[PDB]
């Protein structure tokens, strides 16, 4: 049998993920991919840093999420430190935490529609995506990778503006999602390109430990978005999509309705924000203000020491996970009792979502296999967990 390794080929998509194919003439029936192109030494590296200093290495763990990562870290630290965050701060973590889902669910369709080979829905949506990075630069520090969420809540307040901008932005977005509905849904060939492909629906679709979509849209109703709270996140109203059967085209149609939920939540979140503060007030965790660290005596000693070493975290293990826009996000943060943490093991999606490519692939073509991968939305560097 021919043993071609169609992978390292820089054939668009993402020139990585080099695997083997022991194809039985035309059908595959055996797929054993290799990973480890970026191992980077991540989990060993954090063992020498402090809590505030290690924080951007959670940010660079995806390619896409900037505020959904570091959402799974501060909320994994504030439980250890007996802190609730202040109420103005929680309305921003839901706002940017429900704006990164309008970055994955744009990239999760276009990049899938580029491996397939369509050109024009790649350029028709990233030109609208530019209207959104101006937000990131205006609020935090940079284009994408922002050390913005801290353990002491939000870093700083978003400036004057950004409320007649987001309302200006979000009132003209549903026309753009009505474009791709005409581009892909009512079309037949793309429907014929993906129906009854990847029919994985049994209880081994959950014994493989999958997280969301490539879940509930295939069947079993469950999510971490209204059975487990984060912040002020249950006080808004929305629904969660479910597809019919257990193929890719009934996990594709989650993502059209999923983007039709984030517009509602943003248009529901803006009406409910109170004026208030930014940081936690007790200042053993938050740094004091700049106009304060130049006047009093108490401000500097709880400033100058708070950057030489970090916080004082109590011992005892902990664990949590939140909704990453492609899955769960496990962090088993072992604390020791000093400024420097102990072991920090992460669970990212793709461990389950790509080990189950063995079950999902066989009985099918070779041209099916590239169409499988862009449905799970697998990003490397994120499989470094």
């Amino acid at each position: 049998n021919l043993t071609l390794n169609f992978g390292p080929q820089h054939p668009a998509a993402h020139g990585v993920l080099r695997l083997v194919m022991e194809l039985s003439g035309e059908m595959v029936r055996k797929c054993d991919p290799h990973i480890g192109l970026l191992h980077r030494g991540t989990e060993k590296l954090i063992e020498y840093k402090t809590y505030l200093q290690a924080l951007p290495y959670f940010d660079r763990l995806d390619y896409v999420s900037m505020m959904c990562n570091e959402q799974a870290y501060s909320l994994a630290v504030e439980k250890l430190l007996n802190i609730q965050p202040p109420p103005r701060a929680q309305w921003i973590r839901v706002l940017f935490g429900e704006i990164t889902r309008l970055l994955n669910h744009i990239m999760a369709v276009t990049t899938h529609a580029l491996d397939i080979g369509a050109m024009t829905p790649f350029f028709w949506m990233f030109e609208e995506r530019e209207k959104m990075f101006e937000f990131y630069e205006r609020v935090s520090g940079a284009r994408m990778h922002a050390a913005y969420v801290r353990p002491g809540g939000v870093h700083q307040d978003l400036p004057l503006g950004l409320m007649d901008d987001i309302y200006e932005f979000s009132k003209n977005f549903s026309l753009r999602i009505d474009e791709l509905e005409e581009m892909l849904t009512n079309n037949r060939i793309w429907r014929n390109r993906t129906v009854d492909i990847g029919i994985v629906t049994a209880e081994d679709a959950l014994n493989y430990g999958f997280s969301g979509v490539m879940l509930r849209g295939s069947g079993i109703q469950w999510d971490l978005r209204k059975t487990q709270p984060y912040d002020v996140y249950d006080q808004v109203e929305f629904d969660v999509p479910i597809g019919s059967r257990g193929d890719c085209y009934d996990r594709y149609l989650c993502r059209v309705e999923e983007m039709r939920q984030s517009i509602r939540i943003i248009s529901q979140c803006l009406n409910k924000m109170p004026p208030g503060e930014i940081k936690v007030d007790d200042a053993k965790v938050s740094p004091p203000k700049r106009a304060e660290m130049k006047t009093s005596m108490e401000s500097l000693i709880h400033h100058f020491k708070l950057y030489t070493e970090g916080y004082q975290v109590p011992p005892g293990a902990t664990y949590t996970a939140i909704e990453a826009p492609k899955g769960e996000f496990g962090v088993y943060l072992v604390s020791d009792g000093s400024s420097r943490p102990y072991r920090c093991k992460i669970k990212a999606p793709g461990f389950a979502h790509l080990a189950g490519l063995d079950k999902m692939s066989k009985g099918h073509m070779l041209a099916d296999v590239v169409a499988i991968i862009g449905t799970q939305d697998i990003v490397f560097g994120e499989v470094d967990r």
Partner: protein, 176 residues
């Protein structure tokens, strides 16, 4: 809650099949839809002519390093080493010494612009507000041997401009 999408049984009668038969046979689909949504070509191309035109920014945008000083030159740096201890890449290296006047200053001052991961915490750690991430992306030399910035780049680089820097701090220091 719920929603059952793509869950709809067909019509299956005499007349509505003629809407599904004219679709496949004469292609009232795929042209009314996909030949019109492409054209849609008459819109204006939103392209920036980069060597002439430039895009928007923010007043808190990061970039090139620089050092400031007081009115008539004083070296605002006090070498309190705090930017070093929070640099995640340890791109800072400072050796200090008592200068003969008596007040302490610096001797070596380094920013590994290769290693520099731009966490910008140096801008938010100096008490006397010395180092500033200056907003100019002018870069791209030709050797690895050049981007290691010594001190006499940085005071010079902090003095190619100041009115660019001094207006952005003065429009943003109330927030932080």
């Amino acid at each position: 809650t719920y929603k059952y999408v793509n869950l709809r049984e067909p019509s299956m009668d005499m007349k509505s099949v003629t809407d599904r038969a004219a679709q496949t046979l004469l292609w009232t689909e795929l042209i009314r839809g996909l030949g019109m949504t492409l054209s849609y070509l008459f819109r204006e191309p939103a392209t920036i002519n980069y060597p002439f035109e430039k895009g928007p920014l923010s007043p808190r945008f990061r970039g090139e390093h620089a050092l400031r000083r007081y009115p008539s030159g004083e070296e605002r740096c006090i070498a309190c080493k705090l930017c070093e201890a929070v640099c995640p890449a340890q791109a800072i290296t400072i050796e200090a010494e008592p200068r003969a006047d008596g007040s302490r200053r610096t001797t070596r001052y380094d920013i590994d612009m290769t290693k520099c991961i731009y966490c910008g915490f140096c801008q938010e750690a100096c008490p006397v507000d010395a180092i500033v991430e200056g907003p100019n992306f002018e870069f791209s030399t030709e050797t690895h041997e050049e981007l290691l910035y010594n001190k006499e780049k940085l005071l010079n680089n902090g003095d190619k401009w100041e009115a660019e820097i001094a207006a952005n701090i003065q429009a943003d220091y109330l927030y932080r």
